[PDB]
């Protein structure tokens, strides 16, 4: 294998050389021409109370009105964000939930965690009660993320270093994505749904093709675990949050890092990241209990969302870009605008 | 100002709130325990006396105990250990047959105990330390001296002294003795000890809350 390891080093050098060759200009130099965004002063429009433990995940419905939140009190709550009404309260069989998802159709929600199982719930039952439609088992590590593709397809990343595509109808994992050397902590699904990107504790992010089960590209540059990952609205780029306290913007077509969002007073890790509808903003959650808004093109800290008494564990921007929701370990979700 | 169906939806939301708070009250009065210990530490037999996380629910002298065996999680503890920051106490299992049984497992057990005890998430959380397999240890000590694992041990190779040496060696790994306690025990006596330790933890937390401690 020694000669094969030398060949591997040669290939690493070749890809580095190619990326350097295409690295003609930096994003900051290109963006120097455009004006900064004014101080982004958002304020809390709603506060969603009812969770009695640390909120670990939240997700918006495609209607930009309903959102599901998962907390380790063993509950998924579906909120009417306009009125703050609770639509549903789903009791989980395992209270150690670490991720939740909302079907684009709105018919189902999913969740998972330390149980290593992704459970799908049917919201639109004739009986008038939400019940588990299936339990996707097969992961040997905790479920870190899950995202619906259709009513029948869901992709889940796990702490066993692998992601898997599932056929909810049969319960079998259609595809298994392998290659990460550490726990896969986050997973972002492309706008076209044909690609998804995952970030793992090996401080790398990989681009996968859903249908071919193929790892197309690998992105590195973080010094620590990648806790969060999000696709740029165009789908041609994505941003990663890390424990090393920096967000980084990567481009699929350029195949390298574009820009890094860091500041000296920010020494803690990043729990969640999210873009705005236009992509000009990059909202990120931090362990220091507040969320920082970043000018995605200038890397300037455009604003701050400081309203939480504990770690901001999750973010979310509605599909229409009208509001931002931030869950936190203080057990409150807040809608900002 | 609200519609009829808007008012009905609000009523539904208030019902959900009532159920949520009832469940919260039900959960608040339950004891949560985290069970740890590397390898064949005897936890597989500890769980019997009371595919990922294994939750075990039991009641003893009118306390509801939830015990979380997370030993099957072959993943980075760094990423999910904070989920348990809030458990009443941690149960740590150590096998005293691991003096010379190599992966010398007792050094790995000491490293794991050091990591768990001095974790930033468990500053207040106390530790119940179970020292299992005292029986086999009582014979192995005769045939194999304890110096094999701790060359600096100056005591006699007798059970009564070696056991105390192991206990103090594990308890000295506590770098925050001013805020955290360790309840060591050599393994209904076992569940009785768990009950005693958690009762003490609860009482001391309450006394701190009310200003008496």
């Amino acid at each position, epitope marked *: 294998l020694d000669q094969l390891r030398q060949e591997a080093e040669q290939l690493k050098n070749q890809i580095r050389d190619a990326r350097k060759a295409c690295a003609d200009a930096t994003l900051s130099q290109i963006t120097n021409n455009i004006d900064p965004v004014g101080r982004i002063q958002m304020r809390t429009r709603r506060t969603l109370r009812g969770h009695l433990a640390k909120i670990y995940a939240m997700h918006w419905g495609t209607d930009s009105r309903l959102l599901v939140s998962a907390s380790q009190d063993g509950k998924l709550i579906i909120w009417d964000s306009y009125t703050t*009404n609770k639509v549903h309260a789903i009791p989980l069989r395992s209270s150690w939930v670490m991720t939740c998802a909302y079907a684009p159709s709105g018919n189902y929600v999913a969740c998972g965690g330390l149980d290593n199982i992704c459970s799908i719930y049917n919201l639109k039952t004739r009986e008038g009660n939400v019940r588990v439609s299936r339990e996707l088992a097969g992961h040997t590590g905790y479920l870190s993320c899950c995202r619906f593709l259709d009513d029948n397809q869901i992709v889940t990343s796990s702490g066993d270093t692998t992601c898997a595509l599932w056929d909810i109808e049969t319960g079998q994992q259609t595809t298994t994505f392998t290659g990460h050397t550490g726990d896969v902590m986050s997973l972002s699904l492309a706008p076209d749904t044909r690609l998804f990107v995952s970030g793992a504790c090996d401080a790398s992010a990989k681009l996968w093709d859903v249908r071919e089960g193929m790892c197309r590209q690998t992105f590195t540059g973080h010094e620590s675990d990648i806790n969060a990952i999000c696709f740029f609205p165009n789908g041609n780029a994505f941003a990663t949050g890390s424990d090393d306290a920096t967000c980084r913007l990567f481009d699929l077509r350029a195949d390298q890092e574009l820009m890094t969002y860091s500041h000296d007073n920010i020494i803690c890790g990043i729990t969640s990241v999210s873009f705005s509808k236009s992509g000009r903003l990059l909202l990120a959650g931090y362990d220091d209990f507040n969320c920082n808004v970043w000018d995605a093109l200038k890397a300037d800290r455009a604003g701050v969302l400081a309203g939480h008494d504990n770690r901001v564990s999750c973010l979310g921007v509605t599909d229409d870009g009208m509001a931002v929701a931030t869950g936190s370990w203080d057990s409150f979700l807040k809608i900002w605008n | 100002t609200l*519609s009829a169906e808007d008012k009905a939806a609000v*009523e539904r939301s208030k019902m959900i709130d009532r159920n949520l708070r009832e469940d919260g009250e039900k959960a608040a009065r339950e004891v949560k325990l985290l069970l740890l210990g590397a390898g064949e530490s005897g936890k597989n037999t500890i769980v019997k006396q009371m595919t990922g996380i294994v939750e075990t629910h039991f009641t003893f002298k009118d306390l509801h105990f939830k015990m979380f065996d997370v030993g099957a999680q072959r993943s980075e503890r760094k990423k999910w250990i904070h989920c348990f920051e809030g458990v009443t106490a941690i149960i740590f299992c150590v096998a005293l047959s691991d003096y010379d049984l190599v992966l010398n497992r007792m050094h790995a057990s000491m490293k794991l105990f050091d990591s768990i005890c001095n974790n930033k998430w468990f500053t207040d959380t106390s530790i119940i330390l179970f020292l299992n397999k005292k029986d086999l240890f009582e014979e192995k000590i005769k045939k194999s001296p304890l110096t094999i694992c701790y060359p600096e041990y100056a005591g006699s190779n007798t059970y009564e002294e070696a056991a105390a040496y192991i206990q103090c060696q594990f308890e000295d790994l506590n770098k925050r003795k001013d805020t955290k306690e360790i309840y060591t025990h050599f393994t209904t006596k076992n569940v009785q000890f768990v009950f005693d330790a958690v009762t003490d933890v609860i009482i001391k937390n309450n006394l701190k809350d009310c200003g008496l401690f």
Partner: single-chain antibody, 232 residues
Framework: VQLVESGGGLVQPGGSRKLSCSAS????????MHWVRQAPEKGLEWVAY????????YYADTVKGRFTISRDDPKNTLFLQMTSLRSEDTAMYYC??????????????WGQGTTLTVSSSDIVMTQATSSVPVTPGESVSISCRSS???????????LYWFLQRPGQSPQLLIY???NLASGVPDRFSGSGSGTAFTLTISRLEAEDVGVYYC?????????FGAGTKLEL
């Protein structure tokens, strides 16, 4: 899902009687329940409502004080205590389930109902066209109007459409004037505006024959239309 009402019969005027309905195949405890009557040769009329959790109860002015509605959630049974029975109370009584949350479908299931015979302001809903000859395969339209505008501040138009085929209980077609109920063919379409609504059937099938009723859900003294008959 099944609702089976029981207790129908013949009562002398001035008497008292108790109707019952046993729920099965759904989470009865989480639904609101309605009683809806129908005189032997007239349209529907809302009687009473009991909310999920029994926190709210409503009655029609014609029965308020004479009737009382109650539910036994552990038994999954809905009741209607009735006293001072008058000749006007002679009607087929239906039990209707309705769950209220964002995006739900109130009035989505109707029981078969019990016949009760007795020995010898509100928003007005208008369905002027009482009957309409029809042939299969042709486009048809049902029209409706209301005194108040059913469009609420929050953007919802609280109009509901029901079809009662001969020898059957009413079936929900449209809720909130545009949403097609589950199990309803896409042929039916709900249109309308403030205070004027219409229901249209494209490529009408033979099974789309019966009385089409309109109902408002804006002010809780719920009112039905006179109904429109479709005949082949």
């Amino acid at each position: 899902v099944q609702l089976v009402e029981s207790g129908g019969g013949l009562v002398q005027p001035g008497g008292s009687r108790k109707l019952s309905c046993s729920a099965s195949g759904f989470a009865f405890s989480s639904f609101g329940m309605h009683w809806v009557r129908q005189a032997p040769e007239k349209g529907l009329e809302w009687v009473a409502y009991i909310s999920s959790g029994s926190g709210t109860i409503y009655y029609a002015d014609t029965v308020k004080g004479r009737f009382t509605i109650s539910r036994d959630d552990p038994k999954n049974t809905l009741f209607l205590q009735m006293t001072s029975l008058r000749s006007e109370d002679t009607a087929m009584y239906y039990c209707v389930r309705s769950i209220y949350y964002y995006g739900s479908s109130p009035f989505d299931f109707w029981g078969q109902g019990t016949t009760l015979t007795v020995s010898s302001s509100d928003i007005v809903m208008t369905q002027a066209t009482s009957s309409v000859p029809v042939t299969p395969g042709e486009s048809v339209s049902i029209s409706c109007r209301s005194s108040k505008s059913l469009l609420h501040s929050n953007g919802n138009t609280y109009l509901y459409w029901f079809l009662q085929r001969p020898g059957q209980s009413p079936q929900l077609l449209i809720y909130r004037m545009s949403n097609l109920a589950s199990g309803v063919p896409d042929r039916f379409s709900g249109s309308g505006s403030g205070t004027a609504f219409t229901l249209t059937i494209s490529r009408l099938e033979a099974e789309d024959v019966g009385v089409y009723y309109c109902m408002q859900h804006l002010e809780y003294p719920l009112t039905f239309g006179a109904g429109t008959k479709l005949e082949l």
